[PDB]
Design a protein around this ligand. Structure first.
Ligand SMILES: [Ca+2]
Ligand SMILES: [Ca+2]
Ligand SMILES: [Ca+2]
Ligand SMILES: [Ca+2]
Ligand SMILES: [Ca+2]
Length: 385
């Protein structure tokens, strides 16, 4: 019957009425890339390629969550210590106002007493519809609430504590109750993380997005999820985020493969591998990460008002995203600006990725651990030194 497809277009010639004309509909018009999500009867896709202004028709691929379960006063999970976050908190817990982290995942238990105060914005992109309603944005799986707690669980007398326990979180639900998500919804969730709550990327028109107090963009997009497919419009959204000054962090994958899933495999994205508490790379961790982090036996928040232990590269990812939030929060607190994102290759202290690379606890890049295990305390020293 009806398939979902993503059309790359020339906006001067693409007439959307041509798709309604063949029994299709417009699902979502991207604001930041020239592309549109459409539903068409499957036997009419051939007619789509043929319309004026249609440059490419791509099918809607599937990505999936990358965390799975391991089988009272406040605990500091072993991974938060390993990554050397508690030492940083006298400088910053990430609570500097221009800083937000967007977590594209299964949603969040937004009224969880260890999370709520840091939940700044809650949205859903599922099924190509942007929803800002609470029932839509709530986590129906648990995995997002877990990823989120590793980043930002409160420092208090309950539960757990995240890497950056003061940072504002934008929860962006791009994955359903089963942890499965379409590339379409994930590209839309990324656009939303750039647009933010006011729906405009660059409201004052000055060319600054991430790190501009006049805007409400996130500064980190964290994606603990992956698929085998490399689609154009998705990689275009990645570049829009990258160009806006957003650091993008994604899980390597859990199939013990030689290279990362997507989007972790894009040059603009920090691929993240998983270690255990013995500083062994997990066997499941996809190889050639950029950096690695705690991803086995990770205790964190879980629905509802509860706590759970999970494992996977999905768990390693938010430790890195939390480190990035500390670097950017410390740098903005001292200077009144953030660092550039940087590249895989980078070994300077002038770039977030540069700092991640050279402060990593290398156990010189390798195909197992990447540059090594991120260390917040040392990264924040490099950023400020
Ligand atoms: Ca911001
Ligand atoms: Ca806590
Ligand atoms: Ca905005
Ligand atoms: Ca601006
Ligand atoms: Ca401005």
């Amino acid at each position: 019957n009806t398939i979902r497809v993503i059309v790359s277009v020339d906006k001067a010639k693409f007439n959307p009425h041509e798709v309604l004309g063949i029994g299709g509909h417009i699902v979502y018009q991207f604001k930041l890339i020239p592309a549109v999500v459409v539903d068409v009867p499957a036997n009419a896709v051939g007619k789509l390629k043929k319309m004026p202004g249609v440059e490419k028709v791509e099918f809607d691929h599937q990505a999936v969550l990358l965390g799975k379960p391991s089988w009272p006063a406040q605990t500091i999970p072993w991974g938060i210590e390993r990554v050397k976050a508690p030492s940083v908190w006298s400088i910053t817990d990430g609570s500097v106002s221009v800083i937000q982290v967007a977590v594209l995942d299964t949603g969040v238990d937004y009224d969880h007493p260890d999370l709520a105060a840091n939940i700044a914005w809650c949205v859903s992109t599922l099924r190509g519809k942007v929803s800002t309603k609470l029932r839509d944005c709530a986590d129906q799986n648990g995995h997002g609430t877990h990823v989120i707690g590793t980043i930002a669980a409160l420092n208090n007398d309950i539960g757990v504590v995240g890497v950056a326990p003061g940072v504002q979180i934008y929860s962006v639900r791009v994955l359903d109750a089963r942890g499965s998500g379409s590339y379409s919804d994930i590209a839309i969730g990324i656009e939303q993380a750039i647009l933010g709550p006011d729906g405009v990327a660059d409201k004052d028109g000055d060319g600054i997005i991430a790190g501009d107090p006049d805007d409400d963009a996130a500064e980190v997009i964290s994606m603990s999820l992956g698929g085998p497919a490399d689609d154009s419009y998705l990689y275009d959204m990645i570049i829009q985020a990258y160009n806006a000054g957003i650091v993008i962090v994604a899980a390597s994958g859990n199939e013990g493969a030689p290279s990362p899933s997507y989007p972790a495999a894009y040059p603009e994205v920090i691929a993240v591998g998983a270690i255990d508490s013995n500083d062994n790379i997990a066997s499941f961790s996809n190889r050639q990460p950029e950096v690695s982090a705690p991803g086995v036996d990770i205790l964190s928040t879980y629905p509802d008002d509860s706590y759970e232990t999970l494992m996977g590269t999905a768990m390693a990812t938010p430790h890195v995203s939390g480190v990035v939030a500390l670097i950017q929060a410390a740098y903005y607190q001292k200077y009144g600006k953030i660092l550039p994102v940087g590249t895989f290759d980078d070994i300077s202290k002038n770039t977030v990725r540069g700092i991640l690379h050279i402060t990593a606890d290398a156990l010189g890049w390798d195909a197992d651990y990447g540059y090594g295990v991120v260390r917040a305390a040392l990264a924040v020293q490099a950023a400020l030194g």
